[PDB]
């Protein structure tokens, strides 16, 4: 507990990126203008969840490796606590050592957020049968997050970086099947002391 692992990640956006407004008030304010709002801050920066993506990446990969990892993604699934993702990301009984911040943007809305027209086309007519409007995050947009691991082990940085490469393969949030969310990660890791603030 005397040491702590700080993992500063910078996510560069390479494809478009849709994440969804979670706030009912912000949705209802924004669904008079756009049908799929982007999750933004009140300080007008884009918010992306990060803990669930890294967790899901690690459970998919470690279930594929054959390691004992419980599937927390099933409905009302209770984590066992005797896992390896349960130590990083928590269980019913022990909090996760890896506190994972949101991916907040360096820039703001109206600099990385753009407002787009999506379509749905009849197959036998080739005409626009439906139209909606979404909000998307442009390419080259930089997001920063910090993962602080409280009781660090050796496998934590490798597991986080692995999970990040799974996100660079699959996607970070939203419509990952139509091409959205393909991003890249740059990692800067350092091992600080816990008594670095105490003067």
């Amino acid at each position: 507990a005397k040491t702590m692992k700080k993992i500063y990640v910078t996510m560069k956006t390479l494809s478009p990126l849709y994440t969804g407004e979670v706030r009912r008030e912000d949705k209802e304010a924004a669904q008079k203008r756009v049908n799929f709002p982007v999750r933004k801050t009140a300080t007008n920066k884009v918010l992306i969840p990060f803990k669930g993506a890294l967790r899901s990446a690690l459970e998919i990969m470690l279930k594929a490796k054959g390691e004992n990892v419980c599937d927390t993604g099933e409905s009302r699934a209770r984590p066992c606590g005797r896992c390896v993702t349960c130590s990083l990301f928590g269980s019913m009984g022990r909090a996760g050592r890896a506190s994972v911040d949101f991916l907040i943007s360096n820039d703001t809305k109206e600099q990385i957020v753009r407002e787009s027209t999506h379509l749905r086309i009849e197959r036998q007519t080739k005409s626009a049968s439906d139209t909606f409007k979404g909000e998307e995050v442009i390419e080259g947009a930089t997001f920063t997050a910090t993962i602080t691991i409280s009781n660090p082990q050796e496998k934590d940085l490798s597991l986080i970086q692995s999970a990040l490469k799974f996100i660079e393969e699959n996607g970070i949030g939203g419509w990952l099947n139509k091409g959205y969310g393909r991003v890249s990660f740059e990692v800067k890791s350092e091992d600080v002391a816990t008594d670095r603030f105490l003067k």
Binding site: N106, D107, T108, E110, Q111
Partner: protein, 518 residues
């Protein structure tokens, strides 16, 4: 509050940062300014001369500006100047400051508001007024809760023959002003150019393309010069067409064949060389620095704006016009921030101190809100102390105040068409698909910019091109004859022009019945 980077003025409204200008006067010095600018919510380009604009794509390149507010004609003149200056930066192959990508991204976040139109951004009310320098010259009035600020802009002159001569001014209270002290011999030109071509020789008038060549052209047009006139200028012809497009932002006398047709636009470089070999007026060059061949045969009356200097064609203000601009504001300002050489600022500041106004050459005034109604009779409904009240929001320049019915009773102590005829005409032209939802939406975006922006827009959509008889409307859906289709287009022109006269709430109530999103 107001930081002075340069022209570069930043106003920290506590809630947001409003940069006004970001101009160009080594690279690390320009970078010092851009780094100091910080994140600005807004850049307001007073005008486009690359001295109040220019380092604005950099603010888009390094992501420091969310949105750029200007005049529409300032936007298009900035477009021409940014492209041309990037072309020049490659002529001397100087590692360019910004790219073309930064130029195209600069208009991504641009926004246009014309004049006398108050845009509320981040607790600041911003309004534009004319100062008669160039086409979209603007003095900016930002009212914040810590004071009202006026950036004069390059107040123009009485010489201007293209713009008004009294630059317009906020009708409210101006606390701080940031004036600028850069500090009719025309008939002589109309004499001597009439002399020289009578002598059989040619005339040369080297003038800048932006807001100088057209005043030299206007004079040569409202007056009669039987000898021929030409424009051998590459941005110059395009900005002359920009005058002919954005003539609605000019003088009221010139609301309605500008520059007549005297000017012949020299379109090609082949025409430039053959014109320089001609025998038979050529306006060209930038500070007499195409121009080189003309120089040879004009050397073989060369006027400066037979060596000749004429000062009548000047655009910047004179000490007296700056003094008259401050002496015409309703309230004398608390402090004149005399910016932009030392000697001019010193002599103007003495006259200002002689006129008993303060100057600093680079007081907690809070616009409070006054309740002025009883709060004793409150109630608890759902964890809130509320009282329904009936009153009026009075907007005195010192302080906003809220008043009851007692106060209101004690203080009491363009073509025109009817609303029903406008509704009927918009419905009938919407059914025959002249007026469409895209047309109504584009009209609403231009009408949000101002009345004159919508007047230009419908003038563009209704102008029948003289070369090919194309009016730029949407054609009618039916079996109408040619004169009936022309009467329908006239009906659409007068209907939208008459709707321009109304207020925004009435226009929104009329149009949200055809396009339920505009």
């Amino acid at each position: 509050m107001i930081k002075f980077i340069g022209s570069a003025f930043l106003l920290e409204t506590g809630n947001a940062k409003i940069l006004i200008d970001c101009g160009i006067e080594n690279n690390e010095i320009i970078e010092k300014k851009i780094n100091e600018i910080g994140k600005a919510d807004i850049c307001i380009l007073t005008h486009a001369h690359l001295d109040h604009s220019g380092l604005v794509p950099l603010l888009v390149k390094k992501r420091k500006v969310n949105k750029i507010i200007s005049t529409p004609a300032t936007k298009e003149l900035c477009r021409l100047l940014f492209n041309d200056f990037q072309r020049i930066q490659e002529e001397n192959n100087d590692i360019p400051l910004y790219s073309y990508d930064d130029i195209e991204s600069s208009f991504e976040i641009w926004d246009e508001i014309d004049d006398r139109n108050t845009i509320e951004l981040f607790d600041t009310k911003i309004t534009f007024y004319n100062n008669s320098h160039i086409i979209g010259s603007v003095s900016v009035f930002i009212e914040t809760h810590n004071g009202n600020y006026l950036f004069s802009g390059d107040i123009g002159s009485k010489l201007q023959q293209l713009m008004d001569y009294p630059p317009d001014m906020p009708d409210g209270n101006v606390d701080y002003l940031i004036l600028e002290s850069t500090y009719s011999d025309r008939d002589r030109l109309l004499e001597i150019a009439k002399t020289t071509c009578e002598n059989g020789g040619k005339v040369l008038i080297p003038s800048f393309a932006i807001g100088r060549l057209q005043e030299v052209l206007y004079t040569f047009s409202n007056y009669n010069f039987n000898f021929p006139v030409y424009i051998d200028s590459p941005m110059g012809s395009k900005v002359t067409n920009l005058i002919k497009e954005y003539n609605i932002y000019l003088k009221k006398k010139l609301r309605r064949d500008l520059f007549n047709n005297k000017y012949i636009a020299i379109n090609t470089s082949n025409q430039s060389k053959e014109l320089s070999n001609s025998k038979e007026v050529i306006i060209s060059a930038s500070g007499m620095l195409r121009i080189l061949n003309h120089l040879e045969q004009i050397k073989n009356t060369l006027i400066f704006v037979r060596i000749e200097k004429l000062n009548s064609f000047s655009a910047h203000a004179d000490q007296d016009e700056l003094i008259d601009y401050i002496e015409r504001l309703k309230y004398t300002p608390y402090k004149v921030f005399l910016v932009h050489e030392k000697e001019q600022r010193e002599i103007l500041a003495k006259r200002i101190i002689s006129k008993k106004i303060r100057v600093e050459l680079p007081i907690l005034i809070e616009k409070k809100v006054v309740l002025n109604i009883n709060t004793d009779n409150m109630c608890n409904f759902a964890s809130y102390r509320l009282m329904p009240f009936s009153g009026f929001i009075v907007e005195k320049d010192d302080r906003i105040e809220i008043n009851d019915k007692n106060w209101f009773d004690m203080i009491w102590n363009l073509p025109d068409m009817s609303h029903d005829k406008i509704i009927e005409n918009i419905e009938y032209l919407f059914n025959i698909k002249i007026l469409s939802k895209n047309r109504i939406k584009e009209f609403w975006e231009e009408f949000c910019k101002g009345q004159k922006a919508a007047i230009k827009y419908i003038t563009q959509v209704h102008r029948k091109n003289p070369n090919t008889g194309r009016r730029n409307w949407n054609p009618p859906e039916g079996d109408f004859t040619d004169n009936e289709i022309e009467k329908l287009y006239e009906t659409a022109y007068n209907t939208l022009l008459s709707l321009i006269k109304y207020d925004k709430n009435k226009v929104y109530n009329i149009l949200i019945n055809f396009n339920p999103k505009l």
